[PDB]
Task: inverse folding
């Protein structure tokens, strides 16, 4: 009934159990033979009696079940925490990796609601990307989480755009380069450049080199708030602007506008929504993460028009493809 | 499908959104006339744009709904966050009160799984009850949270025991006295004493006075690891032993055994799920809280027999209580 539902929604221990079990690679250990609690505790380096208590709640919430007496086995839902599942939900729930670590910022959500400012720095001592610049493991973990998709997640946006009159593509904060590579495979005449931060540029280079695309896709280390390294016919902003508050996003959009060739276009790859369609879990998860990690925000369809106009741009067309959008921006 | 379920179970922002809305008294402000985001931000002292983003997730999870354009209204489930609902779920999710504050100990759950030791102290600087002894606001909201049930939650365990041969009852760690009061109204010949800590003894005394029971129920400040202040025919341990690891629970149980009158009994009011029945959300919520708050634990039916034996006791009988709780009656072995 109504009481049961509210207790479940407000329960902080349940997602922490899911995250703890992910961090211990508990499902992997079961799958690699660790039948009993005794052997599971050995592999995860935990107290048997406490691990049982954890496992009890994992059975209660339907991630593990008991097969034979004392033998715990993942359910269909628990199997998604195997480290080799395509959705990478174990690493995304791993408290040592960048995202689940950043989610501890939600423990201070009232502060963000009162001020509109992110809470990450009050916990970890630096803002999100400064923290990542001083912690190579966090830098690398963040890039690998977002790029867990890379081989196929940019196939759809690359197909949604006519590359016939594109000669060079600049991917501004393009991660490990998977979007650039998707376009390259889709359009052999096109060349590309990825602009990224320290650390990320190295794994982007080796990923692109390992696709056999280093003849087609360059990587430049730099700062997207400074003049861009080069001009281009299509400039990519894929899950970049939501990281930034309005004024920084306009500056980023302004830098991209300065770097368009005649006829060029700015492409935004992001989750958006008509306002009255945005009261959904997918939108809020990303939007509220952006608030507490960085002070960024998801933007409704209506708000893209205004941000575009501040940058001297217009939204020319939107295409729906999670469920993502490709926004095509032209000079106003 | 399976992926959607796991993302929902792992989501940390959803309970923090619930807790934030509880702490801002948001549903209360809506119900007292705040019909816009603008008026709600005024009453909650928050940034309008950020409050809307919070509200968005509250609509997506079914606590709020949009009635008219811009007018957000609690659902049937959201109405349980009204401050005067009998289940007290707003204060139980209020991040300024003791329990939701303590729940932040779950952020370090792997440490407790690795060591078996609570994480509360590493976050707030002192163990649970030392923290509460130095924070009168936290002492008072913890007592008020557990006693939010007071008027009716002890009617069942008091009716599960025959008070015929009982003259005095000692309620060891008995909160604000709600249990002692239930017995008093159940059995007019009975006298009682509540043993509690500083702070709690004062609200226990005024609660009992305000029931008209100060003729029947005394309150004594002290420490139930020391010799108890008095002997009794029935000694109550209601939601006390789960706060403690085995060795500390044996000491408390031993202190009670030393204080029993001839023929006396120890009454344990708690859960007692058979191990095979304990893989359920009620058992695990309380058990995992005790782990990270205090290093205590819920005890299965099987484990009650072991702990009783360590204290020189036997579980004499068990009565399931209607509402799933139990009264366990312990006699000398
Ligand atoms: N000042 C700056 N100059 C250049 N790049 C930056 C930057 N600040 C952040 N970045 C990069 O912006 C990216 C945002 S994550 C999106 C990565 C990639 N575009 C993608 N698309 N879809 N999934 N992943 C991160 O990598 C950051 O390093
Ligand atoms: N050394 C000590 N000496 C005396 N009381 C203590 C104590 N340590 C903790 N307590 C008290 O033990 C209580 C546990 S909460 C249960 C309160 C009451 N028995 C009840 N039953 N059902 N709901 N509430 C708290 O109050 C504490 O102060």
Result:
């Amino acid at each position: 009934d109504a009481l049961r539902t509210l207790i479940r929604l407000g329960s902080l221990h349940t997602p922490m159990v899911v995250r703890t079990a992910a961090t211990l690679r508990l499902v992997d250990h079961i799958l690699a033979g660790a039948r009993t609690v005794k052997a599971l505790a050995a592999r995860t380096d935990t107290r048997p009696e406490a691990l049982l208590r954890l496992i009890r709640h994992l059975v209660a919430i339907g991630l593990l079940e008991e097969d034979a007496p004392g033998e715990f086995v993942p359910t269909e839902v628990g199997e998604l925490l195997a480290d080799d599942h395509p959705a990478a939900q174990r690493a995304w729930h791993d408290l040592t990796q960048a995202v689940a670590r950043a989610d501890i910022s939600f423990t201070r959500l009232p502060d963000a609601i009162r001020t509109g400012r992110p809470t990450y720095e009050s916990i970890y001592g630096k803002p999100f990307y400064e923290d990542l610049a001083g912690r190579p493991d966090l830098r690398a973990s963040f890039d690998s989480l977002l790029a867990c998709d890379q081989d196929v997640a940019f196939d759809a946006p690359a197909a949604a755009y006519d590359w016939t009159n594109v000669r060079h593509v600049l991917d501004v904060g393009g991660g490990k380069g998977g979007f650039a590579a998707a376009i390259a495979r889709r359009a052999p005449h096109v060349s590309a450049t990825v602009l990224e931060m320290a650390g990320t540029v190295d794994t982007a280079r080796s990923y692109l080199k390992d696709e056999g695309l280093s003849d087609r896709v360059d990587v430049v280390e730099g700062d997207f708030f400074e003049p861009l390294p080069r001009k281009a016919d299509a400039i990519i902003l894929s899950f970049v602007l939501l990281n930034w508050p309005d004024h920084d996003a306009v500056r980023i959009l302004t830098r991209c506008a300065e770097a368009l060739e005649p006829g060029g276009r700015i492409l935004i790859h992001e989750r958006d929504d008509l306002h009255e369609n945005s009261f959904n879990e997918q939108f809020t998860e990303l939007d509220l993460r952006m608030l507490v990690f960085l002070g960024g925000a998801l933007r409704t369809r209506e708000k893209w028009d205004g941000l575009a106009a501040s940058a001297g741009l217009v939204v020319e067309e939107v295409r729906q493809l999670y469920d993502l959008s490709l926004l095509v921006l032209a000079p106003a």
Observations:
- DSSP finds 18 helices and nine strands in chain A.
- The pocket of S8M (ligand 2) is lined by residues B 129, 146, 173-175, 195-197, 200, 223-225, 238-240, 243 (CB under 6 Å).
